[PDB]
Amino acid sequence: RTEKIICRDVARGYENVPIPCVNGVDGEPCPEDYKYISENCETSTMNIDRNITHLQHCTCVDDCSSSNCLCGQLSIRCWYDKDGRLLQEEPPLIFECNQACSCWRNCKNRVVQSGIKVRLQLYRTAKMGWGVRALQTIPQGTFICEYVGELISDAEADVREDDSYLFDLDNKDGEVYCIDARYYGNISRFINHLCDPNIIPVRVFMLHQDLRFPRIAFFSSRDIRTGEELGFDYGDRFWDIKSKYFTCQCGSEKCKHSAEAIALEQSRL
Amino acid sequence: IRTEKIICRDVARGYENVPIPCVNGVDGEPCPEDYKYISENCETSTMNIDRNITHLQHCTCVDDCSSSNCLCGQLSIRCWYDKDGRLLQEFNKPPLIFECNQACSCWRNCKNRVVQSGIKVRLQLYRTAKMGWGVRALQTIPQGTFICEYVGELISDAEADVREDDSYLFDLDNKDGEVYCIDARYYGNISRFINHLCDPNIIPVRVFMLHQDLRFPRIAFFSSRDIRTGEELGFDYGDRFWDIKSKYFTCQCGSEKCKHSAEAIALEQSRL
Numbered sequence: 265r266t267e268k269i270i271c272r273d274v275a276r277g278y279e280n281v282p283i284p285c286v287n288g289v290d291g292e293p294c295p296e297d298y299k300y301i302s303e304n305c306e307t308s309t310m311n312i313d314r315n316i317t318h319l320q321h322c323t324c325v326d327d328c329s330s331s332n333c334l335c336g337q338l339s340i341r342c343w344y345d346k347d348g349r350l351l352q353e354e355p356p357l358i359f360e361c362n363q364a365c366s367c368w369r370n371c372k373n374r375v376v377q378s379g380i381k382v383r384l385q386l387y388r389t390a391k392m393g394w395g396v397r398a399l400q401t402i403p404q405g406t407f408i409c410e411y412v413g414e415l416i417s418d419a420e421a422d423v424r425e426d427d428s429y430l431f432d433l434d435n436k437d438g439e440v441y442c443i444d445a446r447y448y449g450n451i452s453r454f455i456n457h458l459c460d461p462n463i464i465p466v467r468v469f470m471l472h473q474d475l476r477f478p479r480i481a482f483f484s485s486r487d488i489r490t491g492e493e494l495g496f497d498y499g500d501r502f503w504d505i506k507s508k509y510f511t512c513q514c515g516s517e518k519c520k521h522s523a524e525a526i527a528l529e530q531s532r533l
Numbered sequence: 534i535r536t537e538k539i540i541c542r543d544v545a546r547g548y549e550n551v552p553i554p555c556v557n558g559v560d561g562e563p564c565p566e567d568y569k570y571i572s573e574n575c576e577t578s579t580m581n582i583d584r585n586i587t588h589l590q591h592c593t594c595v596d597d598c599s600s601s602n603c604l605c606g607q608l609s610i611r612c613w614y615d616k617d618g619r620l621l622q623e624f625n626k627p628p629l630i631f632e633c634n635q636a637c638s639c640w641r642n643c644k645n646r647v648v649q650s651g652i653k654v655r656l657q658l659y660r661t662a663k664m665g666w667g668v669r670a671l672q673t674i675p676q677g678t679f680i681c682e683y684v685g686e687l688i689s690d691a692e693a694d695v696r697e698d699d700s701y702l703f704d705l706d707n708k709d710g711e712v713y714c715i716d717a718r719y720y721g722n723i724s725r726f727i728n729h730l731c732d733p734n735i736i737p738v739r740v741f742m743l744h745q746d747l748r749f750p751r752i753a754f755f756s757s758r759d760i761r762t763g764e765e766l767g768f769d770y771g772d773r774f775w776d777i778k779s780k781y782f783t784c785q786c787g788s789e790k791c792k793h794s795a796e797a798i799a800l801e802q803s804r805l
């Protein structure tokens with residue numbers, strides 16, 4: 265079977281680079297049951313707090329590479345190196361520089377807000393439907409893409425029927441919100457769960473600091489080779505609900521969510 | 534004899550598509566720093582802008598949106614872009630632009646994306662002889678070319694009334710309901726330095742892009758004629774401004790048909 269290119273760019277030119285779609289597995293057409301958006305949307309009143317005087321911000325006159333940058337000090341247990349790659353030492357939290365900072369738009373603390381830089385491809389997997397893979401080598405710590413979708417309350421997320429694209433922001437101070445990528449989403453909605461994952465989600469603040477709405481940035485957790493499928497750990501909560509409908513097909517020797525692994529965890533408990 | 538110094542390589546700190554340098558060959562005034570440069574409008578208290586994606590009118594085009602079937606063009610009061618991104622000649626020199634948005638089926642590089650694609654001409658902030666800072670062209674700018682947006686702090690009409698300095702206050706002129714302003718005094722972009730000319734060469738146009746909350750048009754400047762390198766950019770601030778301000782200073786634009794100079798004022802006062 266010939267792997268045919270079925271969309272030159274599922275993002276319709278909204279990302280820094282195209283994201284083409286191919287299918288060398290079956291006859292499934294390019295997915296169109298959703299609306300591709302490159303930034304989060306709302307379908308009810310969220311009214312994100314963008315008040316420029318609510319932004320914590322730095323006074324740096326350099327490129328924000330010094331530990332004196334307030335925005336880097338606000339970042340929790342993570343930092344960017346000279347090449348824009350994320351290092352880590354309570355989940356991490358990135359405060360990037362913003363429009364209130366004295367610094368320039370190309371300072372060293374602007375990785376996620378500068379967008380996709382790696383070449384990605386939407387492709388048909390053997391067993392998991394559509395997936396996303398790298399078309400280049402990707403060093404550990406590189407920004408990949410943002411989890412983009414429809415902002416909704418936890419109460420709204422609880423009542424939605426198709427929860428296969430629901431990302432819980434897990435707010436700890438205030439009410440809990442979610443990103444639902446079912447009806448509106450970007451390339452991240454197609455990233456599958458892997459028990460041997462190679463990317464990690466990290467909460468980030470950029471042009472607003474409304475604590476209801478951290479934005480979700482995926483970074484590679486190791487060097488990724490050309491052609492490798494991207495995947496992250498969806499988490500135990502996801503599988504505790506979805507394993508009633510399907511079990512994990514990642515096929516890894518490390519797999520923790522197969523029928524066999526679930527049965528073995530139930531006997532271990 | 535004073536020669537020209539470059540005193541800032543980019544007043545926008547890299548936030549625009551191109552740098553906007555500041556020069557002064559007239560006096561010792563330093564690079565203006567009594568404001569915060571922002572490349573897009575801000576709020577200091579919420580305006581509750583309607584950003585619900587389902588409220589957007591949007592098109593179904595999969596070409597470049599150059600056909601008469603594009604709903605977004607049909608909304609626009611076809612004004613109006615040509616294949617080069619310029620306003621048409623017979624464009625009404627009021628106009629309203631509905632650009633394509635994130636709900637449209639077209640690509641981000643369609644023909645109805647001019648203002649949202651940002652500054653493309655080369656501009657310079659420079660010290661004028663008699664009007665403080667001004668903005669001039671560093672290149673030929675054909676008629677109808679997008680120049681820049683009037684960017685600042687979105688405020689209510691009531692808030693605009695209580696503010697001390699109104700020299701950077703732009704009224705959005707909502708003929709319908711609630712009235713809002715863009716105040717570029719504390720937060721603004723390069724447009725806050727564009728002076729009044731009685732022979733203007735740019736015009737403001739109301740535009741909608743990522744939202745269609747009709748209370749909050751964004752203000753886009755387009756050239757109204759071919760502009761040559763070195764010409765100062767200017768629009769007609771309007772009589773409402775001058776009816777108030779002419780008691781405190783008169784127009785220094787130097788036009789042969791200046792309407793707001795001491796000479797013109799003296800003529801109008803004697804006619805009455």
Ligand SMILES: CCCC[C@H](NC(=O)c1[nH]c2c(c1C)C(=O)CC(C)(C)C2)C(=O)Nc1ccccc1
Nearest residue numbers: 355427428429430431432434465497498499502505
């Ligand atoms: C589909 C997206 C991934 C599945 C989805 N995952 C998450 O929501 C999620 N939230 C967080 C993480 C993760 C993986 C983190 O790693 C850390 C954090 C601070 C960023 C918070 C999830 O559980 N859906 C879910 C839950 C219940 C029912 C149905 C679907």
Ligand SMILES: CCCC[C@H](NC(=O)c1[nH]c2c(c1C)C(=O)CC(C)(C)C2)C(=O)Nc1ccccc1
Nearest residue numbers: 699700701702703704705706737770771773774777
């Ligand atoms: C300083 C910014 C330009 C001066 C300022 N101009 C405007 O507000 C303004 N509003 C509109 C226009 C203009 C020129 C239009 O051409 C058409 C429109 C639909 C875009 C609406 C204005 O009068 N300030 C003012 C008035 C009185 C006191 C203090 C300040």
Ligand SMILES: Nc1ncnc2c1ncn2[C@@H]1O[C@H](C[C@@H](N)CC[C@H](N)C(=O)O)[C@@H](O)[C@H]1O
Nearest residue numbers: 392393394428429453454455456457512513514
């Ligand atoms: N490890 C996995 N094992 C089995 N199915 C998976 C796995 N990871 C993701 N999926 C499938 O993909 C859905 C999650 C989606 N966000 C991922 C994109 C999805 N593959 C698609 O074609 O749209 C899940 O509900 C599953 O149907």
Ligand SMILES: Nc1ncnc2c1ncn2[C@@H]1O[C@H](C[C@@H](N)CC[C@H](N)C(=O)O)[C@@H](O)[C@H]1O
Nearest residue numbers: 664665666700725726727728729783784785786
């Ligand atoms: N035609 C003009 N004649 C005299 N003063 C002007 C004229 N146009 C603009 N100004 C001055 O500039 C102010 C408007 C500002 N938005 C323009 C930038 C201003 N020149 C500055 O240096 O900051 C007015 O309140 C005047 O002080």
Ligand SMILES: [Cl-]
Nearest residue numbers: 542552553554
């Ligand atoms: Cl320059």
Ligand SMILES: [Zn+2]
Nearest residue numbers: 322324328333
């Ligand atoms: Zn800094």
Ligand SMILES: [Zn+2]
Nearest residue numbers: 328361367371
């Ligand atoms: Zn910075």
Ligand SMILES: [Zn+2]
Nearest residue numbers: 322335361365
């Ligand atoms: Zn900063």
Ligand SMILES: [Zn+2]
Nearest residue numbers: 459512514519
């Ligand atoms: Zn697995």
Ligand SMILES: [Zn+2]
Nearest residue numbers: 592594598603
């Ligand atoms: Zn169209």
Ligand SMILES: [Zn+2]
Nearest residue numbers: 592605633637
């Ligand atoms: Zn459109």
Ligand SMILES: [Zn+2]
Nearest residue numbers: 598633639643
């Ligand atoms: Zn379009």
Ligand SMILES: [Zn+2]
Nearest residue numbers: 731784786791
């Ligand atoms: Zn004049």
